[PDB]
């Protein structure tokens, strides 16, 4: 029924965004489908970039995360105003006012809420506020693989993990991987175990097919809380 | 220069907070020393008991945490209102509205901000945006537990009186911008500037 | 047809519980409105900061954040039959109010009680029945407490409750849940009829409302 | 210290509002003095017109109470922006966001705040929050008169009073009593054609 | 179909009762015909009787605006209040907060929202935030006419126009124009007494003047 | 007194950090010298990436011009957060909202307001609403020439000039704003600047 979708910043440092008007029919599809759906935009170069800037000039840190959020919330302002009819029109900044929010019965997009943690502590957070049993990451890869990709050759997709294999890797025992980088936040890890919320990591140029995703129809990486 | 201070929910769960008195003093001296005061208030027991309420129905975990969070902001609003003009009217929700808040110049008095972490994580949140070295957590005990006069954040990470703290994220603060921690009895606000110089007893968390 | 139900501070003195009629108030083509009382929480502040010397204002002010606190209880427990916010002010209710759903609010302005909290609400929501869940089934002839075999009051008039102002007439548990100047003169303005009640018969709500249920019914004159 | 002024809507129902030139004045002398001053406008003509109105078309009560509150609110915008850079420039529509305006050591100015009170009301809340002990309320008269002075149509003005003699005499409607009451707030009523130093009024002590 | 009515200031000056009657008529007309509409409220004689009053006493042009738009917003609650259970009971003061506010499905009702323009550009940057095809303008006379019919005689109502024609011979300000032409919003002026025939008018069943943008 | 500094886009773009550097320092010196100063930051190449790919997706104009303002608005949290303490840590979003947060007492930033217009337009309105004469326009270029030295003056007036979009020569005419146009990289005299001795452009209101 309720479901959230996360959108690694990565989506928006490409050409284009034409996947959001596919993504406008995803969203669509999963509506018609009796499936409310729930938006989190990270913040991509746009963040590294002004964090840089701060950074070069003294700003804290406190100050750089306050601006890598503003990033993601420039992301979320077009992944909104993409989404006219279907969205609601005004983007949560804090946990709180998305439970308002999402209040409206419309699909509703946030960037980051608070300094100390990334976006997908953001989507664990939504997720957990509106009940949603499934959070989608979507990055731009497969899924997880067995083996670092770019670095091993030729190495196959892993059909499912825990959480705890995620925190083996903030330990420095289990190598990061783009795809498993876009949940290494312990705040994510705490509330999807706590809230036993199912993690499904994809690939974004598959949001047409991510109905197929939600059923197993297509490829992608299931992350199991325990 | 500007220091935090976290009052324990425990404070509140006394049948008596004449202590808000001395503070006042505190702060007005400590003013005068050109130091600048946030205060963070916990839940204590009027947090647990609507979180156990709300429980006992089946409420989900990020409501259980948000009664949690404006039991605390209750708390907020009594210290602020015992405080009134040394303090800019008004409880903010979110470490952007902290920061916000700060920039009046006067005493800015916080309780909880968002699910799943405790106030010591806002303690550490506001220690960072208002740029205080010094977070200082007044609790009903003289320090951490023989009182161990210096302990690290490495200690802390290894997760009594050591329970207020004891908030991952709250840590992770501490150590990028590297906020000295100091535990101490509330019954001795009298004497936060002795115990800032470290005159007098508590227990101190070095970040690491 | 819209209706308000006040939810006394008492309510939530104990250990544990409305959801069940508000789904069924809603199934018969009734809007729900609740206010909640600041109950054991409001006075537990509003003692300690009275003690420090705390004025009025503000001990007023503790009360309605105690009442906050039990609205967002109620509130939290309602999900989905609820717009997930509480107002602040009769203006914010009315804006609330105008999504469709239950709305949940605690108090509004110093100087005044809940109660007259959920006579402004009904007003402004166009409700022609405020309904005031208490801890007893009604109102008494006698005091209950001090008087002994006293029957029940099943109707009464706003006058009855300013007589009490006036010390008149004699409070009790139930006539204590109206007794204020403002509460009064709305429901009388706007002849908005009190059903005073048990909140442990919440889920008789349809009958009560009928006049099928015991109650005491305050008529505004 | 703090003092709260009451302006009538009548007030704002004249050719020209000039007087708002020189209450600019007394409130820099005030302010020079150690005095913090709080403004509270009325509806008015303007209040009454819209009510009128709307009531025509059938608007519920709560509703047309809004109307006035609105109208009460154009007038303290008005207020507000003829004492710029004295004045905190917001609005405060609550109790509450009074009290938030008003921390900033600044002139606040203010209109209604809720249905079934009138701003006699709003003006007593206000005083009683930013701890005034003296409410002035310029109205249309120049102070309290006796209605049934022993000798025909001798009309004499009443310097001194209760807040009971005024609730046997019967603009102070009853949450501004009990308000003025419980918090010991002195009122000064006065006419609002004249300058606020202190002079001919009207005084009524709480009791 | 979204359609936005922007209501001329003299509206709530003279014949108001059954001004107001006939515009809630006409709004529930509206929406039993499948559209949503928006709706913006001029500041009439309160708004320049405050300004006046304001002027006099030397406050600045910023505030003056100020004063106007805080009239014509006093003008939309009365709108607002005339349409509760159709409208989001909500006065939206800022284009941003009209987005949010035009979200919740219902009718929204707006005064201006910042200075230096007037609530025609309002009600254009509106029609064009709410994907709206049709911005009526209801004023007190029929139409656009080559010259004012209250000094020149023989002067008939112009059915259609363009924006370039109107912009030579209240209206349209330089913003709405603007506006209305990026986004080719057609205009359609016609007289407020004849709200109670709204749909007729967009059907060119009855008299109006239409703007075309170009 | 009272003055409104518009930062053109450009600034954000090439020597980044400098620019922020001596901006944050001739504020100081600004702050130093009894000047209230109010900061209009225009929203640059992130605008135009935004604008140009909400366009590419058929996004309609006026979304574009908020993408276009919440851009403009990051770059005010920029320089607000280079700010701290001198400035009041809220960017307003509209000129009333300017208006309350001027009242502070303290630097304010901003960025963008409405759709349909340029930061320009915002930077009058905000000088004319805070009682500002003076608005100093910094952007990539010493001034105004006689004629532009791409193809081939130091005081001028506002009909003279007939850059600046409608709104913001009808606001400036209208409550007599002088307007200097200087080069930002030159902010490290805007005291001089002001006084009238270095390279600059006054427009004058007419
Ligand atoms: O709740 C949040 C969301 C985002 N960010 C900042 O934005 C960056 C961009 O987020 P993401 O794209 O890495 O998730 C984070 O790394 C961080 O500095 C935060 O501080 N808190
Ligand atoms: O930023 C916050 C502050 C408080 N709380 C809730 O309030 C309780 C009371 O806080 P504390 O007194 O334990 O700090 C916490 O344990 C928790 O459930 C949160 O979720 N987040
Ligand atoms: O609109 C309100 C609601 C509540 N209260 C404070 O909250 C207490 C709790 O309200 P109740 O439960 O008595 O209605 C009141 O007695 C009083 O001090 C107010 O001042 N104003
Ligand atoms: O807190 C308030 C202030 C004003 N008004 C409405 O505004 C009118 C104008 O206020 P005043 O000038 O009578 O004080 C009142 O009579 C009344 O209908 C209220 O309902 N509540
Ligand atoms: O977005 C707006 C709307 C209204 N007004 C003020 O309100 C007056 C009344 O509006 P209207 O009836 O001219 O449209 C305008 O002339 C003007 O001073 C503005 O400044 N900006
Ligand atoms: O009040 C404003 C400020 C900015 N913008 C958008 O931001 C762009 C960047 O602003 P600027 O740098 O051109 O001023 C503008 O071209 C435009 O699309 C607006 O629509 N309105
Ligand atoms: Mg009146």
């Given at each position: 029924m309720?479901?959230i ?8 440092d490409?050409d ?6 596919v ?8 509506a ?6 729930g ?14 800037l701060?950074r070069?000039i003294?700003?804290?840190?406190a ?16 992944v909104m ?27 509703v ?5 608070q300094?100390?943690?990334s ?8 997720a957990?506020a ?15 693989y067995?083996?670092?990709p ?9 059909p499912?993990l825990?959480?705890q294999?995620?925190?083996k890797?903030?330990?420095g ?13 312990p705040?994510?890890?705490k ?18 097919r ?7 129809e ?9």
């Amino acid at each position: 029924m309720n479901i959230i979708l996360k959108i690694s910043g990565k989506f928006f440092d490409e050409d284009n965004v034409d996947n959001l008007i596919v993504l406008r029919q995803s969203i669509k599809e999963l509506a018609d489908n009796g499936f409310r759906v729930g938006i989190v935009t990270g913040g991509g170069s746009t963040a590294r970039r002004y964090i840089k800037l701060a950074r070069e000039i003294g700003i804290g840190e406190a100050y750089l995360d306050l601006l890598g959020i503003w990033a993601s919330r420039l992301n979320a302002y077009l992944v909104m105003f993409s989404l006219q009819d279907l969205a609601y029109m005004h983007v949560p900044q804090s946990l709180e006012e998305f439970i308002q929010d999402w209040s409206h019965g419309k699909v509703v997009v946030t960037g980051g809420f608070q300094p100390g943690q990334s976006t997908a502590a953001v989507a664990a957070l939504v997720a957990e506020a509106s009940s949603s049993k499934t959070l989608v990451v979507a990055t731009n890869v497969d899924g997880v693989y067995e083996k670092d990709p770019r670095i091993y050759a030729d190495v196959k997709l892993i059909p499912h993990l825990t959480t705890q294999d995620l925190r083996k890797i903030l330990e420095g025992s289990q190598s990061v991987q783009a795809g498993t980088y876009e949940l290494l936040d312990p705040l994510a890890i705490k509330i999807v175990e706590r809230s036993k919320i199912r993690v499904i990591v994809m690939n974004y140029r598959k949001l047409n097919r991510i109905i197929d995703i939600l059923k197993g129809e297509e490829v992608s990486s299931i992350i199991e809380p325990v």
